[PDB]
Amino acid sequence: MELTPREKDKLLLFTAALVAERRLARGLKLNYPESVALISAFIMEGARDGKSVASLMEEGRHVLTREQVMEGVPEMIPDIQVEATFPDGSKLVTVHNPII
Amino acid sequence: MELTPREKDKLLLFTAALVAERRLARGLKLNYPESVALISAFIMEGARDGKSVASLMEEGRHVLTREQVMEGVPEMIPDIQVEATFPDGSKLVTVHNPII
Amino acid sequence: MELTPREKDKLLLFTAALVAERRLARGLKLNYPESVALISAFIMEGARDGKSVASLMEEGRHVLTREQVMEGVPEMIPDIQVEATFPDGSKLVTVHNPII
Amino acid sequence: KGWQATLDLRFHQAGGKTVLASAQHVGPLTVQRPFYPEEETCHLYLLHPPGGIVGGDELTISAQLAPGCHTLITMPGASKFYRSSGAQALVRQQLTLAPQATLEWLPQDAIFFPGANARLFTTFHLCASSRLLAWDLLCLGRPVIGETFSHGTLSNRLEVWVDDEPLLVERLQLQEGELSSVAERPWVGTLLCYPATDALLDGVRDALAPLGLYAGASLTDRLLTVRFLSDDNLICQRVMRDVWQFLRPHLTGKSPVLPRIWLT
Amino acid sequence: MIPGEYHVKPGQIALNTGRATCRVVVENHGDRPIQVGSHYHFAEVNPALKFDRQQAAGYRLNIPAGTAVRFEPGQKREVELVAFAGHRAVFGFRGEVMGPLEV
Amino acid sequence: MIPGEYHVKPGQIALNTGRATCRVVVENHGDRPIQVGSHYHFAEVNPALKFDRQQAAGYRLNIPAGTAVRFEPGQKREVELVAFAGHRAVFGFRGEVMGPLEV
Amino acid sequence: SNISRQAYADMFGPTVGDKVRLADTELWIEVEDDLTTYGEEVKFGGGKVIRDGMGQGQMLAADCVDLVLTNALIVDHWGIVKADIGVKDGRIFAIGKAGNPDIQPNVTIPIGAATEVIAAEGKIVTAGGIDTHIHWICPQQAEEALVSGVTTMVGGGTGPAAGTHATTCTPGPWYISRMLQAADSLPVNIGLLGKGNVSQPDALREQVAAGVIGLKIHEDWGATPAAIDCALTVADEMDVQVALHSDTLNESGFVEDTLAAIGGRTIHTFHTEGAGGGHAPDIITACAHPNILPSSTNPTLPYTLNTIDEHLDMLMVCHHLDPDIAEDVAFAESRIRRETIAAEDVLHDLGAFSLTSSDSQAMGRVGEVILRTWQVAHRMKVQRGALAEETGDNDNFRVKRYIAKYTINPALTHGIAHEVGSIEVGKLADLVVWSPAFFGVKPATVIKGGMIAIAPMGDINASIPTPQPVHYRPMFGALGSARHHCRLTFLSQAAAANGVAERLNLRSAIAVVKGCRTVQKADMVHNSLQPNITVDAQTYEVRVDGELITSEPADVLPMAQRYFLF
Amino acid sequence: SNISRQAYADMFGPTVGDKVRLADTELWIEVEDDLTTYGEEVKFGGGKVIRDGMGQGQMLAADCVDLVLTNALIVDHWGIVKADIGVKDGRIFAIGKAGNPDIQPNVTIPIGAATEVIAAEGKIVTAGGIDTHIHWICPQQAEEALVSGVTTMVGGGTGPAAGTHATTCTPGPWYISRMLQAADSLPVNIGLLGKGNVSQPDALREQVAAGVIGLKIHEDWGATPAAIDCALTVADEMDVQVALHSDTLNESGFVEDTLAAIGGRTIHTFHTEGAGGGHAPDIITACAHPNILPSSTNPTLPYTLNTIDEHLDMLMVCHHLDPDIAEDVAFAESRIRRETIAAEDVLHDLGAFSLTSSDSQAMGRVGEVILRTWQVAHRMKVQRGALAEETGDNDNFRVKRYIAKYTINPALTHGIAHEVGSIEVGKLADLVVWSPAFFGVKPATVIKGGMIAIAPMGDINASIPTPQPVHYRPMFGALGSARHHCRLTFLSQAAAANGVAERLNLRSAIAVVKGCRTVQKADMVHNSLQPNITVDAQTYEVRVDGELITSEPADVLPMAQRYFLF
């Protein structure tokens, strides 16, 4: 495998997002770290699929609604940046106001 | 996310419990670490749901039965302590004789 | 749990294989690390089930086909070694040409 | 009792070359990875991590070729049959060829130490369009030092079947005591080639000249079989290599280049 | 497209060109096979192997480096030997020379 | 099969054999229970406990080590005392002796 | 007063006559002796014995032990007793009853203000394991072995290089110095093995003066008789151990030639079990010589169904034989036979084999030396039953014999038995505290030179140390200067004379190796047997006194799947 | 004897005339020369050449190399050869045929007792990459870059502070000393860049005497002509490099004023590609001056569909422009055009741009310097075809030109080319061993100063190093004193004269920087082009010799998704 440290960090993010999505499926209201992890992993999986950075920026704002997260969480997340390996290398995806 | 080290430790416990629950679903008999991880994550998820500490102490003894774990495991686990973030802060849940 | 460092490494491999199997279920073509992690975790779960080393060596070559992985990946994986805890202790499983 | 070893190989065509589809083994018989020195021929080496074969060991090799597959099966060293304590060693090779399949079963010589109670059974199952090019060489004793296989039991059975029909059944059975079949020749060699013509027979007879009158090649039902007895270990292997190099282009249409495991 | 693949032009590589060369016949009188490496001083091999050891003094096996030839018990193998190079001083093996080969 | 299980042969373990022994009656005059450990110098216990403290000088509770006896308020408990061993010098507690018990 | 023996066992651990089963095995140890006085045991926590004026004396720091392990069940080659352990200045000060001499009858371990208490009630305290065949491929081994209960590692290597992947040789004064400097960062006692495959004595002398405590002769560097003779001569001159991994090619001769080249000089031979090689099975006969110390790597311990199937790829990767190269698989004929593998376990049981090494990350597992040793002991107990010289219905003799295979015998082999190896007065306080349910698998604490080096810690943010997730973490015994003060670096006598320690600025404490050249097979503890062992190269029928040696492969093993997550 | 060339390539790696494809790219390198003798190659493992008296000589430790990389395929700016590499005392001793001179024809690398063997058969050995634009935001970068194959990092910063987030300046002697002390804990050669945005020469002289090897002029601290002139004068006096990140606001003048302020003095200009800024696209013309050394950050390398979309937020976060503040988005007009981004790749191909830096964690990725350089090379090979001066059907010239961009040219720019930069005799043994299938992505080994620093290790408890999970771990070359001895800290001449090393107790070895003020565009290796480049500020039509320069964005890139998990 030859996992680089960045890949280990991304694995940690993936585990956090697994926790977040299981809690979301349970019907809970996600807090700040759960929402951040869920949106970041959504962006990472979309990039692995092959979507463009602009498309992922547009799509990342419709993963979590205001009623799916705890009160005050949307204001604690002005934007989410995440590095993802698109078919054309590693790129930065910034999602502005991901929860609306 | 701003993951503190304790959150990383809890993520490690969550991964271990994922292993344990997949093996339990396969129909195997869990060993000591798998049983401990499964019960600890059950308590953690119950706390995240919003249950009380006393209720979690009561409910943690009915997650794994004696026939679901390897012989000698129940006596190897006199009790399971776990820290969990209830709506009223971090609290310690102790489950005595979790396997009966 | 008393997780030894080797158990933590195997947990990291398990998380990577979770990523790989989710991507495979999505219908993507796995890359080198995803394929290696998926095959290694298949071998480890088979060992935990109770299969023999020879049986796992035979079975590990039928987890991923040539059309399920990116082009050139099968040639980048001449063999996969993995340590797994069989009922008779820890043993080495070597799968030669795991993708054909 | 006995240390049971079993290997089952299934080949099939994939990506324009023969690939080892399945290698299911139990016990001390292993196949690591095929080699491709040529374009599509699958060069395979059967490993026997235990050096010799002690009394009571039971080896069972089975091979199945899919249609249109060309493979070259070799062992990376001679098979030693040690002196037995009373139990006999059973080596059982069963090889099946689909139509159009080509197989080159080229094992190393089997060296039988004095007092080695052993029994070999190699069978080939072929179709009408299958192609085979194999040999089987036995060294009875250790001729260089003087040992001449005074005692022990040997049973070398070789069979060829074409479309479920026994075309050749070659049996070499040696009882405890003196050996009359070998006639002071401890090197018994057999060569098989299923698609053959009279020109190939003449060429083989030409190649058998340095081996003397003890080498005989007969073509029956298109199958060319060469039986010989020698006592030099240098003329024998040279003749076998020469016959294989002569038959390779006419059977598989390939260069007679030797496998690299034979160390040039 | 094979990552990190080789494109080796066809041909042959001649090994140990322009060196003294010989041929010997080795008989393994032991009960187990003997493996001799490429650069081993052939005059100091296992005493079970029998051949003209005077002729093989200062010679090694003329095989590709890193390979080893195997002598099965009770066999007779003809092998190709190539003379040593450099200072032609051999140390080690059985310690039968422990110095220069000439003078 | 219990991992790391004990197989203790049945019987009794006699504690503090061959030591001077006494019996005292203690009354707890406080409003809260008082717990006294095994090796505490019983003559220097809480003044709320009432008994003949002259007789208890140089004695500790004759109970298994690491255990403590509890005196509930308004109760009357009969306890067994065992004499100290070794140098018989007591330091600490209330500091009522701070030296050897004899001479 | 009097209490039930069950209550006493619960409160203070088993006393004389009680039997404790090791972790999920069939081995039942029995407490042979008790060094305490009933009713005067020292116990800590709340209102208990160890308090001011009750269990803790008024003596000064110089008159009391720095650390005391209370009510420990000491299992060691010299016996299985129940006692307290007093450690002073990082070394074992005394073994016996602890407490305050002022008010307690028979105290040999005075507890004072300067004393830190470790509660070992109902726990087994053993000496730190010693690993004498270690490939220094990665530093992460040092932690891993430390988790497994091994505190001293003797071996060579320079990292994941081709030479280290196959041989335990640290080649050259430069790499020896670099490895010695790097050893200061590892929380284990470390000894370095040089490269002995040289026919020029001056190079070996330079390597020994660089700081190695032994010379390693390996086939991959050439195990020719000339190299063996030169290395043995150099070691005799400089008093260092010689480790031999004899050539499996029979290139320079058979095993008889190698034994003749040794010439009756002390040598520590690896792979003596004949787990594959040209000298197998005859190399097993080498266990019958007084000067040969036979070791055995763990992967072939014990005999299991899966043992053979995993050997070929392990050997090929270890010896740099690429399966993708056609000429390489000519070396795949390892001549490994199940008869020798089955005989190795019985030879360990009889005491013919004195050591159990690891050969870490090169045909061997660093963290499974103790575990596989006890698995072999359990298998031999199951198959062969109780030993001939066992007293009572316990496995005390077998436990003593097997615990000596990785604690004291490796220490005697490499001349470090005067500092580490066993729980004795003056030894380095390298202790491992196990719970009996986890004995040989997962320690409750690893004390390294008087300080806790590694221990299972739970959540750091927790209100107690117990809550999950519990995993092994390095404690203050593995931090900078504290690690340097609580660990040893072994050097040859020439290295100490040359002042290597101050030239390299070795921060850790320095111990000098002595006594390597005089240890014989008789000097091994409980493993001094030199049987009249015969083996037939044709039938592989290993015999001692004309009796067959065989073992059936294990289908299920203890301490394997009940404890480990994966 | 004779063997097939395919068998020889399998056994020893490609020989003369064989072509090797770099990792999943379209670049085919060809072995130009072979420095060995056929049939006498040294190989390790089992019964092979490197053994006592066969490949390993009898010479002493002072007459043999400490380490030998065997059968390496050396790719470097001076050629693509096949040879062994001998390293002695942590420095490259020789390049050529290794073995035993006693029995081998032409040996220039004598292998002896003191020699450790690294098997590089079928592997590519390159010089460690050099990163001259590094923001020292976190120490975890040092490992990450080391995983990527970068061994030397030149840059500034004090941690995740506002100044470091934007500029590579270590402000003041106090922070310079603290960073120098912290550098001892990182397993990479480290050079420090001071803050040059000062109009008072005394502060710059104090910073240089503190220990920085160069001065950084950045817009965020004010890239006014007065500051540029003062910093250039100070550097001329004190022989240090000056790195310029010109102001993008045109506050003090246009690019012509900045060039006039430079006044023909040597300067290392970042962002010369014009990837956004007021000086773009005119700053590209700066590549035509002899005194300008033009660098380029990796994020705009190569031109892809996703390159532009990610630039705005990256720039705003890097330059501390909060999107939540209305007045901040007035700076969001970065004036970034796809024409200049497309032209930057072609300028790299033509050799107009000499360096490929990172600008780590501030508009740039630390671990993707080599990777993105080879991606650019692949894109230029795909689009522009073979170069004009290519000999044969290979990409050897292009490979040399692109490997000089991050190995030797950065070394010459910052005056450290006498110690690191390329695989040459006397250089520091900073080597990266790649497998050809993973070239430029994941090294097989990173040798730092003659010792393995970081390597892919599998399970520690495994019987061999290969089994999963395999991930990169720091080896003994990154442990305490071993790390200190196997790494370099670069200082200015004034700092060495002032005795900064002993005042701060710098445990690592000290190298003194020289030659910064004399390097010109011609001194750059294979990147000495000074084209008559013209650009129109209105049409953004970059032209050289009147010919249009353009590139098409890459939809899919090699070495991107085949290797990385996420």
Residue numbers in the entry:
A (entry chain I), B (entry chain E), C (entry chain A): 1 to 100
D (entry chain D): 11 to 274
E (entry chain B), F (entry chain F): 1 to 103
G (entry chain C), H (entry chain K): 2 to 567
Q: What did the article's authors report about this structure?
A:
Urease is a nickel (Ni) enzyme that is essential for the colonization of Helicobacter pylori in the human stomach. Ni delivery requires urease to form an activation complex with the urease accessory proteins UreFD and UreG. Here, we determined the cryo–electron microscopy structures of H. pylori UreFD/urease and Klebsiella pneumoniae UreD/urease complexes at 2.3- and 2.7-angstrom resolutions, respectively.
Similar to the quaternary structure of Klebsiella aerogenes urease, K. pneumoniae urease contains three catalytic units arranged in a C3 trimer that resembles a triangular disc-like structure. The binding sites of KpUreD and HpUreFD on urease are very similar and involve an area of the α domain flanked by the β and γ domains. This interaction is also conserved in the KpUreD/urease complex, where Val330 of KpUreC is interacting with Asn42, Phe45, Tyr55, and Leu57 of KpUreD.
